[PDB]
Amino acid sequence: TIAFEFDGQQVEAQPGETIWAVAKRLGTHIPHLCHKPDPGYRPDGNCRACMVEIEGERVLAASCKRTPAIGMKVKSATERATKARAMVLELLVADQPERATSHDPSSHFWVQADVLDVTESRFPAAERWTSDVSHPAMSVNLDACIQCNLCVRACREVQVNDVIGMAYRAAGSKVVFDFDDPMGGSTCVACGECVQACPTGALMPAAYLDANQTRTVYPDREVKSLCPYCGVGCQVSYKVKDERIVYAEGVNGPANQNRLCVKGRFGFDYVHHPHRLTVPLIRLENVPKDANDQVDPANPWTHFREATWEEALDRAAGGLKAIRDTNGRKALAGFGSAKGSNEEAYLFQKLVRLGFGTNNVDHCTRLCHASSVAALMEGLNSGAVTAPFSAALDAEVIVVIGANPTVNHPVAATFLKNAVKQRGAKLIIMDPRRQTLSRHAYRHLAFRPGSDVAMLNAMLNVIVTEGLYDEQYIAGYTENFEALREKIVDFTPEKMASVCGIDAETLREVARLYARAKSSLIFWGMGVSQHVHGTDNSRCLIALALITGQIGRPGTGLHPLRGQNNVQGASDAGLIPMVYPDYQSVEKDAVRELFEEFWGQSLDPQKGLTVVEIMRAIHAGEIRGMFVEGENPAMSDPDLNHARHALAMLDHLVVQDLFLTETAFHADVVLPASAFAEKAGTFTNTDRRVQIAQPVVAPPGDARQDWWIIQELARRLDLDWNYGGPADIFAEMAQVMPSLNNITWERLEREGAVTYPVDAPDQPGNEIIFYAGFPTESGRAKIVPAAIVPPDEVPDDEFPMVLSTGRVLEHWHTGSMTRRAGVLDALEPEAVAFMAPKELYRLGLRPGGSMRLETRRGAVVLKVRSDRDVPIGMIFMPFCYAEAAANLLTNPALDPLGKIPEFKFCAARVVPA
Amino acid sequence: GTVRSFAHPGRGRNVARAVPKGRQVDPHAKVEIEELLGTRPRQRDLLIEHLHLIQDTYGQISADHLAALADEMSLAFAEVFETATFYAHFDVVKEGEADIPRLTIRVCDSITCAMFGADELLETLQRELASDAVRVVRAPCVGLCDHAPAVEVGHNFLHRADLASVRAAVEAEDTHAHIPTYVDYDAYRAGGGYATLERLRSGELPVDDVLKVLDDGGLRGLGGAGFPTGRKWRSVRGEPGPRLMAVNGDEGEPGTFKDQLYLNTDPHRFLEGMLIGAHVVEAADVYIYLRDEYPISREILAREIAKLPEGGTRIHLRRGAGAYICGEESSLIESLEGKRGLPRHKPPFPFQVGLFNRPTLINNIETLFWVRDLIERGAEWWKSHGRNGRVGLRSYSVSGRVKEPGVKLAPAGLTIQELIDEYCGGISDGHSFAAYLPGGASGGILPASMNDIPLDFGTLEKYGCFIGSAAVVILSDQDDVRGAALNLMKFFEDESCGQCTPCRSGTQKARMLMENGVWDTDLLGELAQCMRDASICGLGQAASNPVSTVIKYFPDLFPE
């Protein structure tokens, strides 16, 4: 500690602590404008409002910037310092617009001016720049700017989106976007970090201002909850006025530390959309079911009639029970939700396995990471991530393969960019497409689509042959390395360079760089897993991690990113066909008998069918009744023509949703449920973080809680359930989920988030796992070599283009939620596809023109966007557009082990339209 | 078929984007910049040099070329744009904007040239010669005050310019710098030059003997601050290596023109002192930062540097783009690293954390110019000069209402009366000594009644003044003292880097307060104290000196 004297008193200062921080901790508040005491914001010391006097120095010092030293004497109450601070505030007030009609009359600046008794300036005003309202989500009014640079720090050092700069000189210094372009037409991604940082109201949410850029809307209350979209798991503070969410701010959660993306900050609007279901619906007993059926959500009376809750629940449960008691127990199935809470998932799987009496329960994880999970279970006997994404800060080398984190996990990507900028981490990106992140990458490998195994095998060959592996780790914590050493012989970089499209020298350099680093961390996403050979790719990644020993230490491990906000928690609750809760196999007699005693009812011992197998069985007439909750297979399933045929072939389909989705078109009964912001429960993020959600607003009309609806269905299926709410369900689940040991509803409410596994009710959990071995029979991980397998469908003269599908920043999956959010809708209004400019020239197209996209399975028409990140010979398209549904064209062929379709590669043809 | 569609209200905005967000790099622009760069590196610290290459090739920096440059260097658009817009000589032209005329004329409007009618001259040239191919703009002091008024035509500076001579240069296409005759590499070596440096490299002359001669000699920093040079060379040596060196040739204080005189007459005398200091502190590379307004000096140094033998130190020559604040040592470091010239906070100090965060030695051109003489003639020779109790030799840049303006190499500690009468030929006829500026723009304004004050480092601080770079401007009865103060404030208002409130806003409010006919000297008094006490760097801390001294020492100009 650095002991010194402050204002005539003897005090002691912790290391790395400024004078301002010491004074604040001791109660003496010093005014500040450009300093923001929050994580990630380095003090700049430019506004000069925090000046103090240091004995033995000619001029005054900025307290927010200076750290104390032994023997120093600091005085803040002197007439010199107070006069200087007052004059700085008066100079700034001279240029401010009139407070009562300003863009934020209660800004931090005005509060500081109130503290210093400065309300008017003796100095004349200067006319500044005009308003900029080009961006729909945020408003720029730089006539109230004080040039503190907090927005510059927010964009460039915290988020590292690199949009804002401070351009000119002297009093003409100006906040600019790109080349001083309008915000709406710039590279801005609308993360909103600058808005949250700005202390004057120069930058504001557009929803707070009227047409004259005044009078910030004033919320009645603020509620702390989570983001409903992706697996990063940001904590959010929702602002409510007149029982409506109007704006959202980031909260200092362990995952995000006050950071958000556009969907978290501005995408809350869907809960208030007029298409929200308010009453139960029952299909009219006149309208047949068809694959090409269409229902207007604004006018559903063409196909449906409204019903009471009792009548609709009776119809749904009666249809299911009649099918069960006439056609047998194997004629039923259920699709759960990865967007609901852990309690709802537990109740859903319990309902299927007890009321339906079968193991046919599954959700979107079958389409997400099934092959990766299969490889990881074969190798390590576990499917969990081995490190959080925050471990990237401790990693010398970071590998991102088949993932686009600046689009699909933006906050985690900000932490990766922090690692690169502040700690010198070397980032290697392996992806056929260039990305926004590529400019920061030490190397970007742009291999040909579908050829991951060749490149990874070449890297393994380099490591094995040149003797760069960890012999000590291999002999002691792995097995079967001799088989890999024998197999890897035929995968030299020279042979594989033509197959993968990456030169041999680059492959050798990357392999050496990964092996020789002190700590390396691998992230991977859908580009690796969504192939018929995705398990092979995951095996290659696992072997790379195992032979070099880069696992089980800080800054190391394997992190396959979790997509949905609660895919991990739903998997943990047993919402998958092959295991009970906590990944206990339904085939073992011991597990089955334990659950038969716990639930007090005999259980089916056979493994269930997966999502695609279920759709096949529906198409064949084996499955007759289906219950779907929180999923939209009519847009997310592959080969939508046959999938919609199968859905329309059902005898009885019950749908529990927020809107009349494309799946609900074929339903017999539709039950209106509650959105994320209206419910309580627990959700588990990509880092094994269990976090608690709180209701922000009430459900509209007569909509009901998801858990209540499932309880009603169970009670009508001859089950005696009486749950008070989510907390009781949590207690019951914790009785049979050892991974929840020392985690309780009370502790969760008190703390907000706990990482599992955790060994005590007062200690934090283990972020890093596998430090002492693996949960296998022998405790050692098994290396499984991989071989080259071609894609199921490859281009020919008939269909010469490679079609790949994915995501855009502003939209979620099927578009059911994000297209109903006004800001997100405005940002991406129309269906588009991406292609390289040279390909547009060769095909005879123009940017923004229409084209017809065709495969062997379907045809669509949409607009084309020219993109230089797309390789020659590829067309990339999101599946979020109902007017041109990408899954009308995709290949339903499956990975033999993972049972995942090949969304990422098929053959297509393009023609002008 | 199967329109399907979507009931979502986006159909109103349903026009999408034909391209990703933001402006897009033109394939044609990328090829042109790539050939323009050739084999040059793409490190960040070369950004300003690359900006110079585009501006010189095309006469402007179009948004197309600028965007191509950022992609080449892996920088963001706002990164290159914010850097280019900082400097006054870079013209960024966005889409749909008017092009820059082929020829640019700059008329100095600083204090000395204004006394000789620069304000009317600029108005005449704008009315007479401005066209679609000629642009006429104001400029700050270009270090030609002894030849006022000064006008630049392309790269050709005209002494005592007028309408006829400026029009002659344009018609004759005389738009290039005129290189004079100077002492070259061979004549320098025939005069015993570089012999002292050779002894240092071999080891016959110990490094400890160089520092002892400097410390005993009392050589002080001629860039203005006056810090002892020997003590500064020791401090950089004490830090762990590797170490770097940078020469400050950004001579921008209005009224200072001594550095230009020595570069254009005896360049190798400067180059030897620079090389000796680089050996003393064991610096592998030496960066020379020369102001844009000295094209003659830039050409002279380039040829002479190419004539040196294959030594153990590599010399880098860098070029400014117009910024007075870049003379501040930390701001010069940021410019050399390729960024906006914003001064850094202290501590730490540049001699500990400097260029590329290494221990760095910064010296003025004139300070290094005298190093060879001080060793070969001894410290005793240096100290033999001096008057009124002061010790040393000084070069005063004297301009204004004197008969013989120029650089006077005179003993330190002279008074203004002694300097004017014994070296400047006295006040010019039809004028009477009224006031003087001892330290250029930032040193304050004093009445002629105070003509008995010795001018040296530390002697002017009693009256709220300082000698600075010894830029002496002489004013007569036909010279509004309050008009001179407004000129200096207008200079500081434009030259402020804009980082901190007291300087960025204080200079603007002070200028507006002085343009009213009756100054609120009480409000200006309070504002001056805030700028002195709270400004980050020396520019803001001294910008209120002209206002403060005029109020204090000219009471007859302010009615109650």
Ligand SMILES: Nc1nc2c(c(=O)[nH]1)N[C@H]1C(S)=C(S)[C@@H](COP(=O)(O)OP(=O)(O)OC[C@H]3O[C@@H](n4cnc5c(=O)[nH]c(N)nc54)[C@H](O)[C@@H]3O)O[C@H]1N2
């Ligand atoms: N904005 C937004 N964010 C989301 C979602 C969303 O819908 N919208 N969904 C969430 C969900 S559920 C998930 S699973 C995650 C998915 O997150 P990501 O894994 O980032 O999803 P994709 O964009 O499909 O990733 C595919 C990437 O792999 C590349 N690629 C294509 N072919 C190949 C190949 O053969 N090999 C390799 N190695 N790469 C290839 C693609 O060009 C692209 O860069 O995102 C989550 N986050």
Ligand SMILES: Nc1nc2c(c(=O)[nH]1)N[C@H]1C(S)=C(S)[C@@H](COP(=O)(O)OP(=O)(O)OC[C@H]3O[C@@H](n4cnc5c(=O)[nH]c(N)nc54)[C@H](O)[C@@H]3O)O[C@H]1N2
């Ligand atoms: N071509 C192609 N196809 C893909 C993929 C791809 O990359 N390319 N990715 C695959 C992957 S990784 C995934 S995860 C799947 C995703 O496929 P889905 O999970 O079907 O996609 P969503 O649009 O999220 O599904 C409907 C959404 O409506 C909302 N919702 C519906 N009912 C309720 C309810 O009762 N309560 C609440 N609170 N919300 C409700 C939720 O947001 C719910 O997830 O798509 C897969 N399909």
Ligand SMILES: Cc1cc2nc3c(=O)[nH]c(=O)nc-3n(C[C@H](O)[C@H](O)[C@H](O)COP(=O)(O)O)c2cc1C
């Ligand atoms: C606003 C400002 C402008 C300056 N301009 C110059 C300059 O043009 N030339 C110069 O040599 N030093 C200039 N200096 C001083 C430098 O910061 C630095 O102290 C000097 O180069 C050291 O010279 P020395 O090594 O001879 O002492 C300036 C300082 C300030 C605060």
Ligand code: SF4
């Ligand atoms: S919203 Fe985010 S990306 Fe846009 S300017 Fe602000 S910080 Fe940068």
Ligand code: SF4
């Ligand atoms: S816009 Fe706001 S945060 Fe940015 S410089 Fe101006 S006042 Fe500061």
Ligand code: SF4
């Ligand atoms: S990064 Fe993911 S969790 Fe965080 S705000 Fe964005 S969508 Fe929500």
Ligand code: SF4
């Ligand atoms: S005093 Fe002026 S020049 Fe110095 S840092 Fe502050 S604004 Fe920039």
Ligand code: FES
């Ligand atoms: S708050 Fe310390 S200088 Fe702005």
Ligand code: FES
């Ligand atoms: S040259 Fe015009 S004032 Fe120095």
Ligand SMILES: [W+6]
């Ligand atoms: W997914």
